[PDB]
C-alpha cells in the first residue's frame, strides 16, 4: 500500500481509549465503539 494508488481519501477526527482497537473495527461494539465511533461491516481504509 506504500505505493498503491487511490482516489477520494479523507481523514477522520476521533480519539479512543486505545484498548478497544478491535472494537472500533466492525464486528464488535463497546462503551465508546458501540456509540461514538462506528465502522461499516465493509469499510475501506486501515486503522492508524
Amino acid at each position: 500500500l506504500n505505493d498503491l494508488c487511490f482516489t477520494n481519501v479523507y481523514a477522520d477526527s476521533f480519539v479512543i481509549r486505545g484498548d478497544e482497537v478491535r472494537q472500533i473495527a466492525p464486528g464488535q461494539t463497546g462503551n465508546i465503539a458501540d456509540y461514538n465511533y462506528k465502522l461499516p461491516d465493509d469499510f475501506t481504509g486501515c486503522v492508524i
Epitope: 484498548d19 478497544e20 463497546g30 462503551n31 458501540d34
Partner: nanobody
C-alpha cells in the same frame, strides 16, 4: 415495568460462599445493564457491582469492598444475573438488592437505579 427477584441469601459463616440470583420477568435484561446493591439497616444503599449488556470485563464493575471476592455473571436466555460471593465477611451482612434500567453499559460511577427487586438478606455470622 420490569420486576426483579433476589434470592439465595441466608445464614452463612464468615469466609463462606454464596450465589445470589436476580430473576427478571416480563422484560428482557439482555440489552440493559444490571447493578447489584446491598443495604444493611442503618446505612444508606451502597453499590456492590454493575454488569453491562455486553458482560465484558471492561464493562464489569465491582465496588472496593467487593473487589477480588464478589463475582457476577449473566445468562440472558433465562433473564437473570448471578452474584457470587467468595470468602464472605461479617461486613457483607446486608440486604442485597439488584437494580436495572434501560441503560446498557455500566460505569465506575453510574449504576442503574430505575427498577429494584424486593431484595435478599445475606447474613455472615455463626
Amino acid at each position: 415495568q420490569v420486576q426483579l427477584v433476589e434470592s439465595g441469601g441466608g445464614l452463612v459463616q464468615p469466609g463462606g460462599s454464596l450465589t445470589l440470583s436476580c430473576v427478571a420477568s416480563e422484560s428482557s435484561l439482555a440489552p440493559y445493564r444490571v447493578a447489584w446493591f446491598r443495604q444493611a439497616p442503618g446505612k444508606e444503599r451502597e453499590g456492590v457491582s454493575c454488569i453491562s449488556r455486553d458482560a465484558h470485563p471492561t464493562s464489569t464493575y465491582y465496588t472496593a469492598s467487593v473487589k477480588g471476592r464478589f463475582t457476577m455473571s449473566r445468562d440472558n436466555a433465562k433473564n437473570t444475573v448471578y452474584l457470587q460471593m467468595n470468602s464472605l465477611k461479617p461486613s457483607d451482612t446486608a440486604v442485597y438488592y439488584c437494580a436495572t434500567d434501560l441503560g446498557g453499559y455500566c460505569s465506575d460511577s453510574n449504576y442503574p437505579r430505575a427498577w429494584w427487586g424486593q431484595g435478599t438478606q445475606v447474613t455472615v455470622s455463626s
